[PDB]
Design a protein around this nucleic acid. Structure first.
Ligand SMILES: [Zn+2]
Ligand SMILES: [Zn+2]
Lengths: 134, 57, 286, 196, 443, 283, 106, 65, 44, 69, 57
RNA sequence: AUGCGA
């Protein structure tokens, strides 16, 4: 197939070190998802205040932003696999993507943390004392 | 009608001598009866009278 | 249907309504109202929304009154928290009054519907398309003009004058409370001092009034024209009398009036004119 | 048409009392404690309860109406010819209403005192689904005026928010006036045919 | 000093009217909402609204019963006729015949003559033969279209006050109205449902549709780019069944909503459920109504296993009426229906987005059914927009050109049903058919 | 009245004079004691747990307090037993059958009740009742897989508003408005003389009145309907405080009674008149 | 208290796909990755097949062009994320039954 | 998948025919081929409730404030 | 009773609504009649 | 249309005071009140006659069909 | 003050004789047509009220 | 018929 000539086959993929520091139910490793407007260049970052859990204020080229964090839908603490946020894992440049798992349980896994970059705005208050003149 | 939606027909063309004359030496163009105002509450007309008079003087 | 609703504030005149059968059916626009005839910048609005934290509708994969829906012209583009609903509504209005968001025309109408117990179904329905009714109000945070439509107006706190602006409440203020009146209602002097239905009969008189139809009457051929030759400019007028130029086509004249029952032919609906005054040409019409 | 400085003094002083009346009735019909803050969250939820109920909202209108109309009655009974700038055997407006040439004491008080509480189809002002009777009113404004009680008078004018309500009453009057005569023709002809 | 007389200023303006800009910009700006409406039929994106309208009328196909002796029932040679552009010219008058040079026609003339103020309406006709075997262009004159005064098509559109005086007009003539047979007529502005947005309504007509109807329903008035409208209503039956209502040839039609869902995009039942309730997994009310809806459709149409079959079923079931049989398959007729009915404000290929919006309409409808949301008010100015007279002008134009092509097709049908005397190729036939229908839609 | 003489008034009322000896508190007691009580009207909460091979509907109806509805509507839990076991269940079971056509603790005395109601009703399987107050009513309903689907909440609701604890046929409510300008009375929102006839120990029957002309004619005869028309219309003008000579109204009534009935003034009533042209000139 | 980022991986490797609630796929189903190089940007399309159906996924271009997704893998013990660019693809799977049709007419 | 009283085909997401009515071991999809009445038996139950609307009353009114 | 706004027959004649009997029999135009705007006068 | 000959209410000839009054607002750069005071319109009947005038004839006159344009 | 175009003064009409419709031979309609005002049903009934049966005929 | 005095 490899349709719409405007497409190319893949030639370069990367192994996933799932277990180089994994231990079965012993390493509390995590995978996080953050949504980034195309306007930001993630590669020009250095650290990520995702660790604030809630206080995810964020500074992108000295510009202040706030990072909305969600805790449901795909990561819901409610149903067994309440998320379709499917992970597609590769292996090698000569292999097709794989369903994420943590053992051979037919288990689609989930992102431990989901983050979202939200554009902040000054929205300065009205100077009431100047405007509400009698 | 005035600018107040208080419309009325001219019942008669009163002779100028028979009109009432002010000590200013004038007799009005139009006479409207006062009892029309109490139901209509056309008080905008009262102020229009006092303002148009001021503004002419 | 004839019931006068509060939604029309700023859009339709509460007094420009015929009296009779048509009453309530034939509304009249406010003298400060505009009508959308185009649509714009819909193309950049998704981009900025994505910047503001809107989850793409393919990716959100969740839906309900429990969540805020961002839609543009009936194109649902994303979902956010209701809190982000309010954050977006306010920051968006800020970029609208600003000049920094070219994908954001001043005249976009931002329908915020907050969550409400059995209230209006929540959402942020933006509209930019044609035929929208739009009216100016003054946005206080930028002390600059802002265009509001009837949808968003319901939930907006617009103080009527600056001294009545209540703290932490009114985000806009009327430019002038006349902005809520139609043309004829502003044309009536001190119309705010008379019983409303007498003001509406005033609209019916000025609308049914014999006046100056034009000056090209030597080049028209109407089945009827009424042209008052002895025309004057009211001494008492709204400043919109000049701003709308009704002085071009004066429809009446300033007369000496005595408010007096005296002659006995002045009752109820009958008024007397000076005979010599008519002989001097008073109200002469053709 | 003018009052004395005294008559405007009583008028203004009595008109100072409606500010409590608005919410006091709002918490009575809501059946909530006295002086309950105009910003109590439970008050707002209960008031949304009334907003969503046509019957409860109707009772809220009627009770607020009885109280503010009691304030009107107070105002007129106090200020009356007791405060007019010139009295009877001179005050022509009083002459016409009292003689019954034209007018009623209602008209004279509406010029000299206040318009008072507007009503529609038998009850106070419509409310938007946002809980607001005018853009300028926050949802659930407990002011009587925000319910439509107009303190302004024709001699001193009406606030614009107040003109929108007297315009409401004036329209609903013109509608009822224009349909009521069409509802009496068939009553006439239908039985006039029989008793002829 | 508050409303002072402009006395010297006025008398100067009477004596020496402006040669550059009318005063009273509010005066010209007040009827501006009309003029803009009329100009959008001649200028705007691509060429103005009217060219979008002709982009929406699409094609009108007719087959000569191409005999050929599939070549004997698979096309008596396709002939698809459409309209590329539509041109409007400012009023001109040629003297006597036409072999004369035309003159710009002025409104003063229409009034003094007490006649209409007409502009020749022209439209670039595309005559496509055998899907491309032959292309024919024709600039057709469609009679005199009454032009709005001071429009982007009236000579007074750009006249300075002084010029206006030079043309015997009120130095401030607002225009926006029409001189037809000398009588000034305007199109009344109308209050219509706010376009493109689902309005939750309880209406006793909804129960009046028949048995199992509730009061509840959704009404969205989808408006196409060209501003032509198509109203879509959703009705909740007492049985939990949801039906999708629309209107075609001013006849009403009901289809199960689950059919239009499987029709927009191929998806699983789990995808529609996931589309509606989402994280809201707790509405036994909604869970159960949706099991009734989906399971009930699965009961009725167990053989509609895929979206394509559905498309064949819809095109097949209305192909008799959408006038696209002698050429299209039930898949094509079905898809053209989808594109022509369902949230047409979203446009062609918005079919997944149209799907998502439709899911939003189902969710809102159940929010009304349970009562978790308030009902809206069609009659609140909040929920209303304004159909401008000029826009009606454009809709009616679109309808008139669609019908005019319908008349062409009727003429071909009669000729092929009474003679088959002439091939789709003959220029005689193009001129002859054109010469046999009357086409001055201006009248 | 005049134009259509409709035998179905929009606001049918029957006025009841209460004896001088009838206390105001006894009178309010009687007002509560006569008004209809629907089964829905006492219901607090309904939880349906449909568990499916037999399609099981475990309906747990958690009611109000026994004393609460007993003090608002003067009814008991035992009355609820009889109504449920006889009325509610039988009617719901019939509605379930209608839905099929549309498709196509636990003591021995309690066990005997459940078994008896099952024996009277084909759908029910278990019956647990809050005999300690009446706070709830749990009964197990088992249905064949072939039962597919119903909206049991909606079915229950519909049967709930159709069951009555106390119903006077055609009579809805007896209220105790304040007496004014006349004897103490109770104004009912319905018309049923025969039912008030049994209440004679509180109501001077000779003084019963109503707004329903037709009901008067059927019960008390032509002169009572005659006086009812002239009084009711006179009340219509009295509301607007208009004076109208009684001679006019009484004449009009006599014309409506010219045949001894409630002969309206439309074409239907005109038909019986003798002038064919007079008919011709109407409709 | 914020977690630092140690290293970033910027080139295509892992992808994410939104599906129906219940997606599980064969124990071995394989996912063909594609790439598009449009001027200065790649649009991605995924294609796979299974024993009955075939699953094909694509990017929501109007959100794709206006929003860009980043993935990282964090270790609590190493304080380090391996970042992966992943396209989110809303994929639908058609079966052989979804490949049957009638004549083009009756 | 089974949800509430809906059970979707695990392979195709189709709400496959209810195990309670199958004439067999399990079930099978009309879009997919997954086995129903033989695999997960489900124990279909729903806690359905009243909408807190069918029953207006004076007692509800004293219970509503 | 036929099978569009057709010409009316005799039944849609003097009957129905206003018609002849109502509009030209039970009420008619009359000669020796005038219509005018009324004006007050205390001296008559 | 044209400055009235006489003040309807009073009777004072007023048609003579137009051009000078307009000149006096031009030439004398006066104010309407003082201009009318120098013109002698010492009654509001005579004050209003000229104050309210709108000599619209200048607008009519540009439509004269008896000269080419 | 403004003069309304409705000089209903001009609306006066009198007819002591005029045209009649051939299908009735009854006064035609309209002031400009010298038509005759209608004595409608209500005026007929009302005249019967007065007892003026010789006036009604 | 529509609008109109109303
Ligand atoms: Zn399946
Ligand atoms: Zn003078």
């Amino acid at each position: 197939f490899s349709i719409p000539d405007g497409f190319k086959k893949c030639k370069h993929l990367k192994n996933f070190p799932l277990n180089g520091d994994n231990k079965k139910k012993a390493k509390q490793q995590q995978v996080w998802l953050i949504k980034f407007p195309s306007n930001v260049d993630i590669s020009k970052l250095k650290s990520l205040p995702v660790d604030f859990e809630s206080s995810t204020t964020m500074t992108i080229d000295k510009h202040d932003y706030k990072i909305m964090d969600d805790t449901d839908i795909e990561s819901s603490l409610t149903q067994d696999n309440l998320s379709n946020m499917t992970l597609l894992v590769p292996s090698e440049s000569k292999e097709s993507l794989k369903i994420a798992s943590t053992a051979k349980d037919n288990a689609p896994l989930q992102f431990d943390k989901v983050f979202s970059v939200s554009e902040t705005a000054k929205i300065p208050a009205i100077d009431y004392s100047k405007v509400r003149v009698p | 009608s005035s600018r107040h939606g208080q419309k009325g027909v001219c019942s008669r063309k009163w002779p100028t001598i028979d009109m009432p004359f002010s000590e200013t030496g004038i007799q009005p163009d139009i006479i409207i009866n006062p009892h029309a105002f109490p139901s209509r509450m056309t008080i905008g007309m009262f102020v229009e009278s006092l303002a148009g008079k001021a503004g002419a003087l | 249907v004839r019931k006068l609703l509060p939604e029309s504030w700023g859009f339709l005149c509460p007094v420009h309504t015929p009296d009779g059968s048509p009453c309530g059916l034939l509304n009249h626009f406010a003298h400060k109202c505009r009508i959308s005839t185009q649509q714009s910048d819909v193309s950049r609005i998704p981009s900025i929304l994505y910047s503001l934290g809107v989850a793409p509708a393919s990716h959100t994969f969740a839906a309900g009154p429990s969540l805020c829906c961002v839609q543009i012209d009936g194109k649902i583009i994303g979902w956010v928290s209701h809190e982000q609903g309010k954050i977006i509504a306010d920051t968006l209005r800020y970029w609208k009054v600003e000049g920094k968001t070219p994908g954001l025309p001043i005249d976009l109408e931002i329908g915020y519907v907050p969550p409400s117990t059995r209230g209006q179904y929540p959402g942020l329905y933006l509209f930019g398309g044609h035929s929208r009714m739009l009216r100016p109000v003054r946005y206080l945070p930028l002390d600059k003009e802002d265009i509001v439509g009837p949808f968003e107006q319901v939930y907006m706190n617009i103080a009527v004058t600056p001294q009545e602006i209540q703290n932490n409440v009114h985000t806009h203020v009327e430019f002038t409370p006349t902005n809520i009146l139609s043309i004829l209602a502003n044309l009536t002097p001190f119309s705010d001092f008379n019983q409303s239905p007498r003001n509406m009969y005033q609209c019916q008189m000025g609308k049914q009034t014999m006046g100056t139809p034009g000056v090209a009457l030597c080049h028209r051929s109407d089945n009827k024209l009424y042209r008052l030759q002895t025309g004057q400019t009211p001494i008492v007028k709204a400043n919109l009398y000049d701003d709308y130029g009704m002085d071009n086509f004066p429809n009446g004249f300033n007369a000496v009036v005595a408010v007096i029952s005296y002659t006995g032919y002045d009752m109820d609906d009958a008024m007397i004119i000076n005979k010599s005054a008519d002989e001097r040409g008073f109200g002469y019409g053709t | 048409l003018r009052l004395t400085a005294e008559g405007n003094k009583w008028r203004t002083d009595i008109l100072k009392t409606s500010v409590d009346t608005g919410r006091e009735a709002a918490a009575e019909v809501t059946n909530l404690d006295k002086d309950t803050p105009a910003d109590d969250p439970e008050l707002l939820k209960r008031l949304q309860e009334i907003l969503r109920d046509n019957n409860k909202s109707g009772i809220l209108d009627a009770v607020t109406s009885s109280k503010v109309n009691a304030i009107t009655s107070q105002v007129v009974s106090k200020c009356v010819p007791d405060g007019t700038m010139k009295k009877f055997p001179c005050n022509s407006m009083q002459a016409m209403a009292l003689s019954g040439a034209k007018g009623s004491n209602v008209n004279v008080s509406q010029i000299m005192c206040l318009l008072g509480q507007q009503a529609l189809e038998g009850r106070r002002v419509p409310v938007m689904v946002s809980g607001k009777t005018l853009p300028s009113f926050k949802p659930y404004e407990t002011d009587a005026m925000a319910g439509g009680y107009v303190k302004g008078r024709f001699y001193s004018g009406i606030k614009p928010q107040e003109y929108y309500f007297h315009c409401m009453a004036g329209r609903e009057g013109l509608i009822d006036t224009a349909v009521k005569t069409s509802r009496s023709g068939y009553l006439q002809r239908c039985l006039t045919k029989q008793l002829e | 000093r508050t409303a002072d007389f402009r006395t010297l200023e006025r008398e100067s303006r009477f004596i020496n009217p402006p040669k550059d800009k009318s005063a009273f910009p509010l005066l010209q700006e007040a009827v501006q909402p009309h003029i803009g409406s009329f100009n959008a039929l001649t200028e705007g994106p691509d060429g103005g609204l009217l060219n979008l309208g002709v982009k929406d009328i699409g094609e009108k196909v007719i087959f000569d019963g191409k005999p050929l002796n599939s070549n004997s029932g698979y096309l008596g040679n396709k002939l698809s006729v459409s309209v590329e552009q539509v041109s409007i010219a400012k009023p001109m008058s040629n003297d006597g015949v036409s072999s004369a040079v035309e003159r710009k026609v002025y409104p003063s003339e229409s009034r003094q003559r007490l006649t209409s103020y007409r502009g020749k309406l022209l439209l670039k006709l595309k005559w496509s033969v055998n899907n491309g075997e032959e292309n024919l262009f024709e600039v057709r004159d469609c009679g005199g279209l009454p032009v709005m005064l001071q429009s982007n098509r009236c000579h007074l559109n750009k006249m300075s006050p002084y010029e206006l005086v030079q043309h015997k007009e009120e130095s401030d003539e607002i225009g926006g109205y029409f001189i037809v047979n000398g009588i000034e007529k305007l199109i009344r502005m109308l209050i219509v449902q706010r376009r493109n947005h689902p309005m939750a309504i309880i209406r006793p007509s909804f129960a009046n549709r028949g048995a199992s109807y509730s009061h509840y329903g959704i009404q969205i008035r989808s408006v196409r780019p060209d501003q032509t409208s198509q109203t879509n209503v959703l009705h909740y039956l007492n049985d939990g069944q949801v039906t999708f209502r629309f209107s075609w040839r001013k006849n009403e039609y009901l289809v199960p909503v689950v059919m239009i869902l499987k029709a927009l995009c191929h998806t699983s039942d789990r995808e529609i459920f996931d589309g509606i309730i989402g994280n809201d997994v707790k509405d036994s009310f909604l869970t159960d109504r949706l099991e009734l809806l989906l399971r009930g459709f699965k009961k009725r149409y167990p053989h509609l296993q895929n979206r394509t079959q559905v498309l064949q079923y819809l095109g097949d079931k209305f192909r008799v009426v959408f006038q696209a049989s002698p050429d299209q398959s039930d898949l094509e007729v079905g898809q053209e229906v989808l594109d022509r009915i369902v949230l047409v404000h979203l446009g062609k290929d918005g079919s997944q987005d149209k799907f998502r919006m439709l899911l939003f309409m189902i969710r809102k409808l159940y929010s009304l059914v349970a009562g978790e949301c308030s009902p809206d008010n069609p009659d609140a100015t909040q929920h209303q927009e304004v159909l401008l007279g000029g826009f009606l002008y454009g809709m009616i134009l679109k309808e008139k050109i669609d019908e005019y092509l319908q008349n062409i097709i009727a003429q071909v049908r009669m000729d092929i049903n009474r003679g088959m005397a002439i091939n789709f190729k003959d220029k005689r036939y193009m001129s002859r058919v054109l010469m046999r229908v009357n086409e001055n839609i201006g009248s | 009245i005049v134009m259509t003489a409709s035998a179905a008034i929009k606001t049918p009322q029957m006025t009841l004079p209460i004896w001088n000896d009838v206390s105001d508190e006894q009178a309010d007691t009687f007002c509560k004691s006569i008004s209809k009580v629907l089964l829905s009207e006492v219901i607090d909460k309904v939880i349906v747990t449909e568990t499916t091979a037999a399609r099981s509907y475990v309906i747990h109806m958690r009611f109000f307090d026994n004393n609460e509805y007993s003090e608002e509507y003067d009814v008991s839990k035992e009355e609820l037993q009889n109504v449920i076991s006889n009325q509610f269940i039988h009617l719901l079971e019939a509605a379930i059958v209608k839905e099929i056509k549309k498709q196509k603790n636990m003591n021995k005395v309690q066990r005997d009740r459940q078994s008896a109601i099952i024996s009277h009703h084909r759908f029910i399987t278990k019956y647990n009742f809050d005999d300690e107050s009446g706070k709830w009513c749990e009964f197990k309903l088992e249905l064949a897989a072939d039962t597919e689907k119903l909206l049991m909440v909606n079915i229950v609701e519909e049967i709930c508003r159709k069951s009555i604890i106390r119903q006077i046929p055609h009579i809805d409510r007896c209220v105790h408005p304040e007496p004014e300008n006349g004897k103490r009375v109770l104004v009912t929102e319905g018309v049923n003389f025969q039912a008030m006839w049994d209440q004679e120990a509180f109501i001077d029957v000779d003084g019963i009145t109503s707004n329903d002309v037709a009901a008067v004619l059927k019960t008390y005869g032509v002169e009572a309907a005659r006086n009812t028309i002239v009084n009711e219309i006179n009340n219509v003008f009295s509301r607007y405080a208009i004076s109208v000579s009684f001679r006019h109204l009484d004449l009009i009534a006599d014309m409506m009674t010219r045949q001894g009935t409630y002969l309206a003034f439309n074409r239907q009533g005109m038909e019986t008149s003798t002038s064919s042209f007079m008919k011709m000139s109407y409709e | 208290s914020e977690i630092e980022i140690e290293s970033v991986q910027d080139q295509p490797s892992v992808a994410v796909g939104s599906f129906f609630k219940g997606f599980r796929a064969p124990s071995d189903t394989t996912f063909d990755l594609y790439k598009k190089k449009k001027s200065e940007k790649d649009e991605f399309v995924l294609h796979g097949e299974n024993e009955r159906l075939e699953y094909e996924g694509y990017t929501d271009s109007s959100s794709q062009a206006s929003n860009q997704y980043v993935v990282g893998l964090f270790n609590p013990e190493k304080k380090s994320i391996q970042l992966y660019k992943a396209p989110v693809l809303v994929s639908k799977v058609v079966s052989k039954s979804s490949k049957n049709l009638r004549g083009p007419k009756i | 998948s089974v949800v509430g009283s809906l059970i979707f085909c695990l392979d195709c997401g189709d709400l496959l025919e209810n195990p309670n009515a199958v004439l067999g071991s399990n079930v099978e999809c009309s879009q997919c081929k997954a086995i129903y009445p033989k695999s997960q038996f489900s124990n279909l139950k729903v806690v359905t409730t009243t909408a807190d609307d069918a029953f207006p009353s004076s007692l509800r009114a004293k219970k509503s404030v | 009773k036929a099978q569009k706004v057709p010409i009316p027959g005799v039944k849609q004649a003097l009957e129905k609504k206003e018609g002849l009997f109502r509009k030209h029999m039970m009420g008619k135009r009359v000669n020796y009649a005038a219509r005018s705007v009324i004006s007050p006068d205390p001296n008559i | 249309m044209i400055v009235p000959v006489r003040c309807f209410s009073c009777g004072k000839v007023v048609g003579d005071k137009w051009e000078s009054y307009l000149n006096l607002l031009q030439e004398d750069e006066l104010d309407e009140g003082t201009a009318l005071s120098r013109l002698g319109l010492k009654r509001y009947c005579c004050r209003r006659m000229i104050l309210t005038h709108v000599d619209l004839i200048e607008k009519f006159l540009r439509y004269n069909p008896l000269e080419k344009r | 003050y403004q003069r309304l175009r409705h000089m209903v003064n001009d609306k006066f009409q009198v007819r002591s004789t005029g045209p009649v419709n051939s299908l009735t031979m009854q006064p035609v309609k309209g002031r400009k047509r010298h038509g005759g005002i209608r004595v409608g049903e209500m005026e007929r009934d009302a005249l019967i009220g007065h007892g003026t049966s010789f006036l009604l005929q």
